[PDB]
Design a protein around this nucleic acid. Sequence first.
RNA 1: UCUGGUGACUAUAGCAAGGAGGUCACACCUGUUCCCAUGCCGAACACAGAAGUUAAGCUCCUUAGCGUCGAUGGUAGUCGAACUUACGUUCCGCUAGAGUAGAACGUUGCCAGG
RNA 2: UUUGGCACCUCGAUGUCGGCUCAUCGCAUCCUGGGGCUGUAGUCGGUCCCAAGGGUUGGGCUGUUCGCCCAUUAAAGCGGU
RNA 3: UGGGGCGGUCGCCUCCUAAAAGGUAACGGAGGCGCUCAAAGGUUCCCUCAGAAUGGUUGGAAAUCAUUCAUAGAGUGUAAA
RNA 4: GAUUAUUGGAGGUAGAGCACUGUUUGGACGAGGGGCCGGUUACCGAAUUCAGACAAACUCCGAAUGCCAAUUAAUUUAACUUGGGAGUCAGAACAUGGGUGAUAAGGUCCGUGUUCGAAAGGGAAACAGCCCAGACCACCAGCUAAGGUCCCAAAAUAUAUGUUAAGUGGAAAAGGAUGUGGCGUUGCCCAGACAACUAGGAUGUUGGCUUAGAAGCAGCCAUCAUUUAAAGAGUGCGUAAUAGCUCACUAGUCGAGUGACACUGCGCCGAAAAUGUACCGGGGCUAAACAUAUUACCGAAGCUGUGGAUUGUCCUUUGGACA
Lengths: 77, 137, 58, 94
Amino acid sequence: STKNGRDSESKRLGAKRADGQFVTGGSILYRQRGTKIYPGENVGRGGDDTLFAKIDGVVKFERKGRDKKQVSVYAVA
Amino acid sequence: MLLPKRVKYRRQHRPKTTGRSKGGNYVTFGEFGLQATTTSWITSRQIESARIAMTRYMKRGGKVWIKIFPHTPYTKKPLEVRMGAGKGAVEGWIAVVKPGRILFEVAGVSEEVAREALRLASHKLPVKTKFVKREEL
Amino acid sequence: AKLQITLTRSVIGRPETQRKTVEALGLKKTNSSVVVEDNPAIRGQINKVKHLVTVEEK
Amino acid sequence: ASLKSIIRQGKQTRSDLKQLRKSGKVPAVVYGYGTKNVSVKVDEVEFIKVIREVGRNGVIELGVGSKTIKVMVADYQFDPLKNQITHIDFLAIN
RNA sequence: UCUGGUGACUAUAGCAAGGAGGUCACACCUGUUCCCAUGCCGAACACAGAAGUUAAGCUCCUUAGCGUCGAUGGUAGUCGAACUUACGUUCCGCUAGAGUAGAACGUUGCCAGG
RNA sequence: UUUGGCACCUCGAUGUCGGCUCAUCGCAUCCUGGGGCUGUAGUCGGUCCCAAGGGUUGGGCUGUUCGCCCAUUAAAGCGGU
RNA sequence: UGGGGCGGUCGCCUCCUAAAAGGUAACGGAGGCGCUCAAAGGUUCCCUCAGAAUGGUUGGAAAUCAUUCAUAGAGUGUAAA
RNA sequence: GAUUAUUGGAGGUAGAGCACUGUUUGGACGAGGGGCCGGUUACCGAAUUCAGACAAACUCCGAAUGCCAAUUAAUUUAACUUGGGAGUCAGAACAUGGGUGAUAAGGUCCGUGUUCGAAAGGGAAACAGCCCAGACCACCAGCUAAGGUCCCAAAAUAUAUGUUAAGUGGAAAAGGAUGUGGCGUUGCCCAGACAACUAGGAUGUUGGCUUAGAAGCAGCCAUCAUUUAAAGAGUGCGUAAUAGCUCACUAGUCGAGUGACACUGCGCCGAAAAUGUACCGGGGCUAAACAUAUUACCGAAGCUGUGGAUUGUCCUUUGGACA
């Protein structure tokens, strides 16, 4: 017999909005464990480490230092 | 009889055989060497047989290096039984070699002796081989 | 400036990406043709699907 | 120690490179102070003879078009499976 | 336009070594009366001073020594196509990593003194 | 030609093993035939090569396929259908 | 359920398989959960690795104590990421 | 909505690499046990270092492509919302990326494409899944695709240049050999090469351990001058030991070509199964095979030409223009 037939339901992690598109003021941007991506301007961080927009604007992924990344939102319209 | 003292995972995917040698394509320790020309697995008994046949012809003379180690285990079901009730038990240990790979090096002995000893070794192996020296130029 | 494209090989046995590129170029049946002005976009479509078409300046 | 070289023109493709290697030629570069970086071709047999006569770490006054350059070998890509050389980098010591 | 304070740049900015400097600044410095404080201690923090020093930190200069960045050319791998079934070949395009040449011993915004 | 692995035809049916009768094919040759070598003196034997024309026993104990034994034989061949 | 049976398993979480978005199967390969905490929660202040030698009462050689590198190899209630 | 161009972004695969984790081969270095009196000597395990290797559950790095989306621009024609009606939930092969299995299966399980399913036609001898290509209907019209042009059986016994001599073509491998072509590198010579004739084969010397004696030979040699144009304390046949003539040398004749390496293309052997030649489809082929080019022709229900149904989208000529 065997004892290896288990696995968990895959969670739909990763990017949910792209660099350059307009979003509304509560939209999810990146779901992950921990902080692969940090939050930037007008971007929040939830209890599930989820990233969301505070306001309506276009989303920009950018670097933070040498080895880190963040998202930001800017209200140009 | 060569094998590792321990492995994290006992059951592994069988390796890949397409391509050329990632490394180990030049003699570094000795004067002469046996380079591979085709691709196959070597099963840790073939190495022993070749080493013995190459040692006794040199008669406790020069020095021999084995540039290959079987890190990878392969499985086998003992009796031909139904398919698919889990993966089988470890049966042996293998190294994969691709064209360019040096298998054995020798030093401290004459060229003709090296050639004959490596010929005797090559006849114990599942892969085509070729005698080579140190690279210059 | 102007290019005459002509579909020489069929579109069957081929992938849907190539099929849709051939459709976007305005070709329906084999040995059917079309005339269009030269742009790098048209050139990209042609370079994608060149094994199926023949092109001439006109 | 008086090698020749022919300058490669722009955009050598895979096919022409391997045709050049089927012939007795080999691609090379020349860089260093005194000149800018140039891509050339060299005869493998003549290069081997020069190396045999001068040594691995030796100087060569090779000809590039109109002029000549004193130069040392930096590195060389070699194919051990068919024992031929496939690329050579030249460094201008001046 | 020298220093300092405070911000922006992926360390090309760091680390290491060598050599010079000071009451306009910076600092080690003296002590625990008071504020305050050390799961013991004025070591640290905090407080009151300016006797003394450039030694250390800090600033300037020098070195590519370690670390960092890093082309060109070439290669591997690969999209597409055509041969084909070879542990593959050919044509077209993208062109890596590693290594080499080399770069660099920081650039710059605001403010007050000087 | 085995024991198996797969599950492609057949479950509105494709007869299971031995034995009898009757055969037919292959050769990877049991006998007979022709040869080389031999640690073949001769008598012989061993091994290898060529070769498929013909031939290749009767009984005891076995359901027994298989196997052991008794007496012969130039030999008591291995397989497929 | 690579016929069925015996055997094993049946929900949830984490890796690999999984082919650089997401998703993706097998009686494929590895492991865990069926809680715990009134501080191991909130806030405000402060603080910072082991290991290594160095070297010394003790000395397990190493427990404690002391200088310096260490780049998270420390540690993070509980598996892995 | 779709495709492409130009831009921006998420991501950790192929590949590489060893900076973490683990696996590993040699080598050094010096410390702890140790072999000993608390110690030397060797040997162990560890650390630090030098150079080399490995990884689905390692990553200092890192593509191609695919994915998301843009003031987005160019070509195309879908897309979405609501509702009425369904059927389906046994899938198969091929190619490619993978697990499993045995780098077995016309095997099995996923993923990416195509075809069949539900697709006739031409080719692959016949052959659902392979190659070409999607049948509205007539025609004793034409151009091509894949595959082909000796006869079966439409079209080149075409041109040009080579390779092969096995019927390879028209069944495999480890290995073994010359049988020929090609590409280099390199050495051999009228001071005559490479065979082959004969002319010399030695001796102080088996000297020494002298071994069953052995004086080319239980097996270790001590392997020295050289009669000489030229030979060895004997290349070598040998050998109970000798008998050894030359393959250790050369004037002599031979009077002209000659070998090593690599690399390479074709071929040969290895190659045995059962009703009857028995995979070239058959005849038969030394080109009618293979390779490289070129030019013609053939070849489908593909495209074109001519005529005719039917219907749709536009003009609104509902003509039936285009499809």
